[PDB]
Motif scaffolding. Structure first.
Motif, PDB file in Angstrom:
ATOM      1  N   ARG A  11     -17.976  25.084  63.928  1.00  0.00           N
ATOM      2  CA  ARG A  11     -19.061  24.414  64.611  1.00  0.00           C
ATOM      3  C   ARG A  11     -20.223  24.178  63.613  1.00  0.00           C
ATOM      4  O   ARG A  11     -20.514  25.018  62.741  1.00  0.00           O
ATOM      5  N   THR A  38      -8.433  29.911  60.130  1.00  0.00           N
ATOM      6  CA  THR A  38      -8.530  29.492  61.544  1.00  0.00           C
ATOM      7  C   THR A  38      -8.611  27.973  61.708  1.00  0.00           C
ATOM      8  O   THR A  38      -8.312  27.457  62.746  1.00  0.00           O
ATOM      9  N   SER A  93     -20.902  27.529  61.623  1.00  0.00           N
ATOM     10  CA  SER A  93     -20.498  28.613  62.453  1.00  0.00           C
ATOM     11  C   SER A  93     -18.969  28.736  62.489  1.00  0.00           C
ATOM     12  O   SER A  93     -18.218  27.786  62.852  1.00  0.00           O
ATOM     13  N   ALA A 107     -15.525  31.953  62.801  1.00  0.00           N
ATOM     14  CA  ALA A 107     -15.089  33.193  63.404  1.00  0.00           C
ATOM     15  C   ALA A 107     -13.867  33.716  62.652  1.00  0.00           C
ATOM     16  O   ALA A 107     -13.038  32.931  62.207  1.00  0.00           O
ATOM     17  N   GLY A 108     -13.795  35.028  62.475  1.00  0.00           N
ATOM     18  CA  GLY A 108     -12.574  35.669  61.933  1.00  0.00           C
ATOM     19  C   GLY A 108     -11.381  35.521  62.863  1.00  0.00           C
ATOM     20  O   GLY A 108     -11.516  35.320  64.092  1.00  0.00           O
ATOM     21  N   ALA A 109     -10.204  35.666  62.257  1.00  0.00           N
ATOM     22  CA  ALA A 109      -8.924  35.484  62.910  1.00  0.00           C
ATOM     23  C   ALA A 109      -8.671  36.577  63.917  1.00  0.00           C
ATOM     24  O   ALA A 109      -7.984  36.326  64.895  1.00  0.00           O
ATOM     25  N   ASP A 110      -9.288  37.740  63.711  1.00  0.00           N
ATOM     26  CA  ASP A 110      -9.053  38.893  64.554  1.00  0.00           C
ATOM     27  C   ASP A 110     -10.025  39.141  65.741  1.00  0.00           C
ATOM     28  O   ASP A 110      -9.901  40.133  66.432  1.00  0.00           O
ATOM     29  N   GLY A 111     -10.971  38.260  66.019  1.00  0.00           N
ATOM     30  CA  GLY A 111     -11.636  38.302  67.331  1.00  0.00           C
ATOM     31  C   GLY A 111     -12.936  39.072  67.368  1.00  0.00           C
ATOM     32  O   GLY A 111     -13.093  40.082  66.686  1.00  0.00           O
ATOM     33  N   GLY A 112     -13.864  38.589  68.185  1.00  0.00           N
ATOM     34  CA  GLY A 112     -15.266  39.033  68.144  1.00  0.00           C
ATOM     35  C   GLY A 112     -15.874  39.223  66.760  1.00  0.00           C
ATOM     36  O   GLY A 112     -16.567  40.200  66.536  1.00  0.00           O
ATOM     37  N   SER A 140     -24.727  32.071  67.329  1.00  0.00           N
ATOM     38  CA  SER A 140     -23.366  31.988  66.922  1.00  0.00           C
ATOM     39  C   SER A 140     -22.593  33.223  67.430  1.00  0.00           C
ATOM     40  O   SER A 140     -22.996  34.361  67.166  1.00  0.00           O
ATOM     41  N   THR A 141     -21.493  32.969  68.140  1.00  0.00           N
ATOM     42  CA  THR A 141     -20.636  34.002  68.739  1.00  0.00           C
ATOM     43  C   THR A 141     -19.211  33.676  68.484  1.00  0.00           C
ATOM     44  O   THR A 141     -18.883  32.619  67.920  1.00  0.00           O
ATOM     45  N   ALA A 142     -18.318  34.575  68.880  1.00  0.00           N
ATOM     46  CA  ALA A 142     -16.909  34.343  68.724  1.00  0.00           C
ATOM     47  C   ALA A 142     -16.163  34.862  69.923  1.00  0.00           C
ATOM     48  O   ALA A 142     -16.496  35.926  70.457  1.00  0.00           O
ATOM     49  N   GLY A 143     -15.137  34.126  70.332  1.00  0.00           N
ATOM     50  CA  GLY A 143     -14.201  34.637  71.365  1.00  0.00           C
ATOM     51  C   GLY A 143     -13.557  35.981  71.012  1.00  0.00           C
ATOM     52  O   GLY A 143     -13.217  36.255  69.843  1.00  0.00           O
ATOM     53  N   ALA A 144     -13.369  36.828  72.024  1.00  0.00           N
ATOM     54  CA  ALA A 144     -12.731  38.128  71.806  1.00  0.00           C
ATOM     55  C   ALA A 144     -11.314  38.026  71.248  1.00  0.00           C
ATOM     56  O   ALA A 144     -10.869  38.951  70.597  1.00  0.00           O
ATOM     57  N   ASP A 145     -10.631  36.904  71.446  1.00  0.00           N
ATOM     58  CA  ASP A 145      -9.241  36.795  71.029  1.00  0.00           C
ATOM     59  C   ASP A 145      -8.958  36.154  69.665  1.00  0.00           C
ATOM     60  O   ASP A 145      -7.802  36.058  69.255  1.00  0.00           O
ATOM     61  N   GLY A 146      -9.986  35.723  68.949  1.00  0.00           N
ATOM     62  CA  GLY A 146      -9.821  35.456  67.525  1.00  0.00           C
ATOM     63  C   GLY A 146      -9.757  33.992  67.225  1.00  0.00           C
ATOM     64  O   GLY A 146      -9.323  33.209  68.047  1.00  0.00           O
ATOM     65  N   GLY A 147     -10.227  33.641  66.040  1.00  0.00           N
ATOM     66  CA  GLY A 147     -10.398  32.259  65.605  1.00  0.00           C
ATOM     67  C   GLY A 147     -11.025  31.314  66.590  1.00  0.00           C
ATOM     68  O   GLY A 147     -10.587  30.175  66.695  1.00  0.00           O
ATOM     69  N   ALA A 148     -12.058  31.769  67.314  1.00  0.00           N
ATOM     70  CA  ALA A 148     -12.687  30.941  68.354  1.00  0.00           C
ATOM     71  C   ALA A 148     -14.216  30.939  68.243  1.00  0.00           C
ATOM     72  O   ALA A 148     -14.908  31.590  69.021  1.00  0.00           O
ATOM     73  N   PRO A 149     -14.764  30.224  67.236  1.00  0.00           N
ATOM     74  CA  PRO A 149     -16.216  30.208  67.052  1.00  0.00           C
ATOM     75  C   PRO A 149     -16.901  29.435  68.156  1.00  0.00           C
ATOM     76  O   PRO A 149     -16.337  28.444  68.706  1.00  0.00           O
ATOM     77  N   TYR A 150     -18.123  29.841  68.432  1.00  0.00           N
ATOM     78  CA  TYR A 150     -19.001  29.106  69.355  1.00  0.00           C
ATOM     79  C   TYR A 150     -20.417  29.119  68.822  1.00  0.00           C
ATOM     80  O   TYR A 150     -20.840  30.088  68.190  1.00  0.00           O
ATOM     81  N   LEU A 151     -21.128  28.015  69.038  1.00  0.00           N
ATOM     82  CA  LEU A 151     -22.476  27.832  68.534  1.00  0.00           C
ATOM     83  C   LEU A 151     -23.304  27.008  69.544  1.00  0.00           C
ATOM     84  O   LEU A 151     -22.868  25.939  69.991  1.00  0.00           O
ATOM     85  N   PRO A 165     -18.114  36.788  64.679  1.00  0.00           N
ATOM     86  CA  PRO A 165     -18.840  35.562  64.331  1.00  0.00           C
ATOM     87  C   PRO A 165     -19.422  35.583  62.914  1.00  0.00           C
ATOM     88  O   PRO A 165     -19.746  36.637  62.380  1.00  0.00           O
TER      89      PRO A 165
END
Lengths: 151, 153
Positions: free
Chosen positions: B72, B68, B28, B30-35, A29-40, B37
């Motif tokens: 996933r 957000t 899965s 993600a927070g609103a502020d990025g990187g 589980s990761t997230a985009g650097a720009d926010g509210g962008a989960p990935y799995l 998880p």
């Protein structure tokens, strides 16, 4: 069959290390650097007793998120006998990877990024927190590692 | 042995059976502020159309979902996986459709309506689904795109 009593940290750590040695795949589980962008995605891993090694295309969402943020959560095991790892990821070029480590990765997982034409990166993931718990019984002592150190 | 790759119609039926059977998903967010998880398993109810999960409004999952709306889901056992991309909307415990709270409680074993902690339910609308078993099923693994199950032309 019944529900076993909440585990001693010692027994949970032993169980957790066995799991990490046995299982081949993790939810990544990761997230985009720009926010509210989960990935799995599920990835195969090599665990050596202190860090995980995974591999993914450099340009995949996961590759990009690991490269750009360095932050990752791993979900390993059954959901009622789970291991959750919070870790930090560093990229490794296939062309620079030690031979023996590359070979071991390929024996463990069944593929070899060095031979693929698509640009892969390996990522070495250092565990920082580890939680392991079956049931509510085990929420309280679930944290088995904090700040890279088993408790 | 490794059975031949399943067709899209049979994968979809198998996927639907898995969704109806399993109790838990890896959730899965993600927070609103990025990187930032976050991953945890929660229980779910699938009704053939949407997923329903429940968590304290204040939990990291609840906050990420509220702020957000993206999620996933990783469902299924080793090498028989279902991966869902979805959008999530909150429902207050007092604002569930008729019958849904009861169904949820029967499926999962807990009932947010009866707890003191302030819970939200989130209804997750799937947009993309992938399902596969061994490496031979990497090909043909996408089963839904843009919210529609894929049926051969």
């Amino acid at each position: 069959m019944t529900t076993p009593p909440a585990r001693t940290a010692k027994q949970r750590i032993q169980d957790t290390l066995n799991r990490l040695e046995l299982d081949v795949d993790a939810w990544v589980s990761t997230a985009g650097a720009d926010g509210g962008a989960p990935y799995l995605v599920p990835l195969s891993y090599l665990w050596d007793g202190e860090t995980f090694l995974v591999a993914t295309p450099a340009a995949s969402p996961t590759g990009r998120n690991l490269s750009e943020t360095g932050r990752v959560r791993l979900g390993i095991g059954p959901t009622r006998d789970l291991v959750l790892v919070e870790g930090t990821a560093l990229p490794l070029e296939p062309a620079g990877l030690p031979d023996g480590v590359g070979d071991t990765f390929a024996e463990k997982t069944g593929f070899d990024p060095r031979r693929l034409t698509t640009s892969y990166l390996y990522f070495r993931i250092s565990p920082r927190r580890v939680q392991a718990w079956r049931e509510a019984n085990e929420l309280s002592g679930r944290e088995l590692m904090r700040d890279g150190e088993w408790l």
